[PDB]
Amino acid sequence: SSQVEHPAGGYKKLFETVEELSSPLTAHVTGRIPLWLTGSLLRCGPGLFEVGSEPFYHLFDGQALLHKFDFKEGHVTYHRRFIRTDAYVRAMTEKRIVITEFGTCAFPGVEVTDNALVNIYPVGEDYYACTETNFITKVNPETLETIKQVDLCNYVSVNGATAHPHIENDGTVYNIGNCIAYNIVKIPPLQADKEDPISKSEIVVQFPCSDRFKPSYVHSFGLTPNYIVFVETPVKINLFKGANYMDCFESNETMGVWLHIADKKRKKYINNKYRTSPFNLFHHINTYEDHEFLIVDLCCWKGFEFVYNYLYLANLRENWEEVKKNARKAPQPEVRRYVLPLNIDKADTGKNLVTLPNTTATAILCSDETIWLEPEVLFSGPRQAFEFPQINYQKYGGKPYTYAYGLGLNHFVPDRLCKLNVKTKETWVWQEPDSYPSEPIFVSHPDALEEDDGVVLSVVVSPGAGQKPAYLLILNAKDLSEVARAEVEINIPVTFHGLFKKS
Amino acid sequence: SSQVEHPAGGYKKLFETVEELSSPLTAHVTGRIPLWLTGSLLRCGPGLFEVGSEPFYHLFDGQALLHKFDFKEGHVTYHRRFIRTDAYVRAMTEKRIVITEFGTCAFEVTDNALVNIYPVGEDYYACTETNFITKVNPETLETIKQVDLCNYVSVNGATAHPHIENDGTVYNIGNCFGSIAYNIVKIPPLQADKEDPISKSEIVVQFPCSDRFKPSYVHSFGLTPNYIVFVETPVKINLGANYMDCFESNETMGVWLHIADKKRKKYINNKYRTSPFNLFHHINTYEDHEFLIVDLCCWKGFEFVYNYLYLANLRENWEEVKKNARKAPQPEVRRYVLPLNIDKADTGKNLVTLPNTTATAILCSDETIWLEPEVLFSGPRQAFEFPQINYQKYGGKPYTYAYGLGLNHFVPDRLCKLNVKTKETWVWQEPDSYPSEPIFVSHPDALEEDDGVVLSVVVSPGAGQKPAYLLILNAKDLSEVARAEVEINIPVTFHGLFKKS
Ligand SMILES: CCCCCCCCOCCOCCOCCOCCOCCOCCO
Ligand SMILES: CCCCCCCCOCCOCCOCCOCCOCCOCCO
Ligand SMILES: [Fe+2]
Numbered sequence A: 001s002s003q004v005e006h007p008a009g010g011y012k013k014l015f016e017t018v019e020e021l022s023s024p025l026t027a028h029v030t031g032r033i034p035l036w037l038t039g040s041l042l043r044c045g046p047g048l049f050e051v052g053s054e055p056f057y058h059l060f061d062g063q064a065l066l067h068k069f070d071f072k073e074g075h076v077t078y079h080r081r082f083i084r085t086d087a088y089v090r091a092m093t094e095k096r097i098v099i100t101e102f103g104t105c106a107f108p109g110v111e112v113t114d115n116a117l118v119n120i121y122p123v124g125e126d127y128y129a130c131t132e133t134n135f136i137t138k139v140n141p142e143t144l145e146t147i148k149q150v151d152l153c154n155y156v157s158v159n160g161a162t163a164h165p166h167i168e169n170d171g172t173v174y175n176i177g178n179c180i181a182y183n184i185v186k187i188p189p190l191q192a193d194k195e196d197p198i199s200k201s202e203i204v205v206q207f208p209c210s211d212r213f214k215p216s217y218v219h220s221f222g223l224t225p226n227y228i229v230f231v232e233t234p235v236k237i238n239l240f241k242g243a244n245y246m247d248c249f250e251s252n253e254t255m256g257v258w259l260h261i262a263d264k265k266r267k268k269y270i271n272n273k274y275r276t277s278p279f280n281l282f283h284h285i286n287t288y289e290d291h292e293f294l295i296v297d298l299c300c301w302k303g304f305e306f307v308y309n310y311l312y313l314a315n316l317r318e319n320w321e322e323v324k325k326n327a328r329k330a331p332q333p334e335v336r337r338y339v340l341p342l343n344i345d346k347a348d349t350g351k352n353l354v355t356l357p358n359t360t361a362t363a364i365l366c367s368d369e370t371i372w373l374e375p376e377v378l379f380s381g382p383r384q385a386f387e388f389p390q391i392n393y394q395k396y397g398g399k400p401y402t403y404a405y406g407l408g409l410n411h412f413v414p415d416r417l418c419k420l421n422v423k424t425k426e427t428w429v430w431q432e433p434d435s436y437p438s439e440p441i442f443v444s445h446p447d448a449l450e451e452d453d454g455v456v457l458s459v460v461v462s463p464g465a466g467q468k469p470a471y472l473l474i475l476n477a478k479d480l481s482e483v484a485r486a487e488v489e490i491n492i493p494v495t496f497h498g499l500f501k502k503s
Numbered sequence B: 001s002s003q004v005e006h007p008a009g010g011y012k013k014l015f016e017t018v019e020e021l022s023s024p025l026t027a028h029v030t031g032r033i034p035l036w037l038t039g040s041l042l043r044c045g046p047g048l049f050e051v052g053s054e055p056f057y058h059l060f061d062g063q064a065l066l067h068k069f070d071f072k073e074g075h076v077t078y079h080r081r082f083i084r085t086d087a088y089v090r091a092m093t094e095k096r097i098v099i100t101e102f103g104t105c106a107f108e109v110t111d112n113a114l115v116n117i118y119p120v121g122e123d124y125y126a127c128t129e130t131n132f133i134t135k136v137n138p139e140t141l142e143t144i145k146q147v148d149l150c151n152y153v154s155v156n157g158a159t160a161h162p163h164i165e166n167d168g169t170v171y172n173i174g175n176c177f178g179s180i181a182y183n184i185v186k187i188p189p190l191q192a193d194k195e196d197p198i199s200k201s202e203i204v205v206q207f208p209c210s211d212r213f214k215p216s217y218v219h220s221f222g223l224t225p226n227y228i229v230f231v232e233t234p235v236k237i238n239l240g241a242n243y244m245d246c247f248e249s250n251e252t253m254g255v256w257l258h259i260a261d262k263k264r265k266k267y268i269n270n271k272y273r274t275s276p277f278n279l280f281h282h283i284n285t286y287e288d289h290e291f292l293i294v295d296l297c298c299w300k301g302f303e304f305v306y307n308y309l310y311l312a313n314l315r316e317n318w319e320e321v322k323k324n325a326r327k328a329p330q331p332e333v334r335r336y337v338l339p340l341n342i343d344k345a346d347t348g349k350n351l352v353t354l355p356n357t358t359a360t361a362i363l364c365s366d367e368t369i370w371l372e373p374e375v376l377f378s379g380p381r382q383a384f385e386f387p388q389i390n391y392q393k394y395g396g397k398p399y400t401y402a403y404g405l406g407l408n409h410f411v412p413d414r415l416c417k418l419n420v421k422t423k424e425t426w427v428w429q430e431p432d433s434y435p436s437e438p439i440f441v442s443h444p445d446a447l448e449e450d451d452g453v454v455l456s457v458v459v460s461p462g463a464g465q466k467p468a469y470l471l472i473l474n475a476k477d478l479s480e481v482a483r484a485e486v487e488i489n490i491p492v493t494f495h496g497l498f499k500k501s
């Protein structure tokens, strides 16, 4: 949890417009940048929160800004360019808001936003900035130049895809989108023919929907070597409904949460009716197989009200006492472990199927064949969210693991970095006053023997008058002890997701 | 949690018949018994697990044995006598099982008071969960008389966990014919007229039932100055059969929570709902602004946990005990927060605006209030059970500390302290040592909540030790202060009290 209040209101600088750079800046290093840290921290976020006198209203509306911290021989540069999306280009052309964003209607067929402010991921030799629509934007990871807009609907049958695709070691990309059903998209690795892997995209498996005409909002999903896990939440999209995307969301009060598993290799939906209490879910932490059970670690919000209702910029820009009051009635954040039994024996009807020796998670087989799940709580703090979770993904993604790293939210304000041991539930915290960090990204030491042998990288906004406005933070992944910072002389707004590109 | 396995199977001595004493034994003290500790630790449990060649089958079937550890000037005595119930007397007379027990059919409702003992006026009553409570002499352990609560108030039975206010007022709950309902019994304090307070018993409030003909099993309930809290679980009573044979699990209802205004004697029609669990022991309940804090020892699932407490299963070797518990409900300490002020304008939102909890209460359109708990403690088949607090000063009030018996696959093998604010735990544990419910005794001049000792009866069947002892831990850190060792075995005990003198 946080041990800090924010009366000075410095968090408002997260939601303030900035200018892009013409070329990279030098960043003043304090401490020692690891000499093995060679590559680029690439991150996406909103950078322009108004077009002249026309404001963007929601956190997910601001125009995509691509950030890069380059590391080489203990030296750091910072560069950023706005992504030349239809949304951005047409806004600069017409000097107004042209395309409707998540929570901001544009005034005068349907022009869906391509504002790729959320994440960036590799496909073959290419990198794509994304939002949660059918439009992803190919970007140059060295110059940050915008290359091309790609419409996924040209290639596969989905209305959109999440900003959280899973990426196997061979470069295979998995994603999910509604079409009502939910389709798993598989993009293969780059072949010897060297054609665009997106032109070889296919639907491998389909998940059914709880409502014939209303798909659940899906932000992320789980992947193991053998299984795909999809969590159907009571946050529903109502297509029937000057409207924006936010206006289409409603809460189903009665359904609670339905969990779904598919056989990855046999490409089959498994008709196991996993059920539990209502929660919002944005980020899966990790998923793995343990005997005949799937371990499903989730960042949950307890309730069926859409958490995005609390992320309007006008509310996030209020003074600290008003920010805390606004969050009082919001869903409570909680890290939960669910355990999904794969072998359901009818003889065990009415009993707990989770026979694993190291968990308090339960799965009750009911007479109607529904399997009622109770979680093991890994972390819980009052309006203290362990969010934007990251692991040692390359080596422990989809596999038994011990450690997760997170951004700590204090009434939705990011004010700390967190490490969670998911086996012992021990936590580590890094926190300084009037300092607002981003999602921590783990980079392994090249000679790593342990899971947490490496560093986490975070972009920190420090608007305190006796400090430079922002810096790149490097923590030791062992104990979250500071290793170095690279300070820059310009402000950096909020960033959501990113990756470390090794070179 | 426990850090111990039990391959030697010493826990079997918890479920072995013992003989009563004709007079108290001296107990060899190691360490120092506090000189302010003056009174009697009274505890109830099964003592006779067969009548000749006829066995009792269930943990809650053995014939009531009343235990007493007396403390005075740093010296300890141990005494025990079988309670002369109808069940016991008729069994000794006929040399067989006469009365049907919880999980043993006889080939007449049981009065086998093996569960708890509590004060009413100047008197002490051993109880089970029936209409029959047994007046006992707390000094000699002599059985005085049988009391039928049905003679006085409209209940089919009452729990072994009555709440007792500082003035001596006794509250209890039992199912009744309202169409089935649950009645709260109030027994007043002893008046100047000095007549039996049980003859002045009355029903103050009635809770409705989820099923017209099937009452939920109720083991305990919550009490605050202003409120009564009742948790209706999916474990239902469906009326050569015994009591166990009547229990079934309602798969669809989950858990219904109920509040009544204590002083205005009114049921409040707030439809609190959550996921299914078994509940035996409330830890504590208290009021915090317009919210009730409800701390519970829960078992996650709707299967009756009592299904796992047959003596044949509890007497198995350790590897078989652990395997038997694999598919059982998981124990978990949970904090629920019940909002008292429900505004329709907050429909679809979390009503729990308290700053120090992660517990939620969602107001639904059908006016159901869906609860999610804050988890205070969770360990794999490691139950924090038989909870105790500084009851006299913190019962029904804001509090920090709970003490518990730690169950390891249902085997008691440790003593636990829980800080319910920080979730920090303390453990006391020795190999091949099986303790009982810890009872907190305050230093008489204490201003702080945990300024005192906890008392536990420990079975230590290890060949290089005396068979049992009274354990005294410092309530601050559960560090050992003294033990009083006895040269005879003591079977399992459930509940009790410290009677100050
Ligand atoms: C530093 C960031 C923290 C401040 C905000 C608090 C976040 C609360 O946690 C919620 C986690 O949200 C998920 C993170 O990803 C954010 C981007 O995803 C939403 C993008 O939606 C735009 C798509 O809309 C068009 C599709 O219909
Ligand atoms: C030293 C303790 C070790 C016991 C191990 C098993 C305990 C599992 O936890 C469950 C707690 O059970 C409640 C504690 O109270 C015990 C007695 O309550 C049950 C009495 O039921 C008798 C009912 O008989 C009459 C039916 O109408
Ligand atoms: Fe996200």
Ligand SMILES: [Fe+2]
Pocket: B160, B161, B219, B280, B281, B494, B495
């Ligand atoms: Fe009990």
Ligand code: NA
Pocket: A431, A432
């Ligand atoms: Na500090």
